[PDB]
């Protein structure tokens, strides 16, 4: 309801997404990209774009 604090949670959308990927990468490498998108609930191209950003 507060527009001043709304800009912070909009920036946390990418921060918490990268933080959620830490729980996915817990079994180190050799994970399926399609299996990652099913857990986070995003498009394949959306996940591949965020993984290349980190």
């Amino acid at each position: 309801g507060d527009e001043l604090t709304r800009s912070h949670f909009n920036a946390l959308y990418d921060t918490l997404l990268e933080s959620n990927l830490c729980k996915i990468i817990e079994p180190f490498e050799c994970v399926e990209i399609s299996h990652i998108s099913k857990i986070i609930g995003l498009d394949t191209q959306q996940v591949e774009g965020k993984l290349s950003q980190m």
Binding site: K23, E26, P27, F28, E29, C30, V31, E32, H35
Partner: peptide
């Protein structure tokens, strides 16, 4: 793994 107890690398393709 996140708790710093067991260290294992899961290989999905294999």
């Amino acid at each position: 793994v996140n708790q710093g107890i067991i260290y294992a690398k899961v290989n999905r393709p294999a």
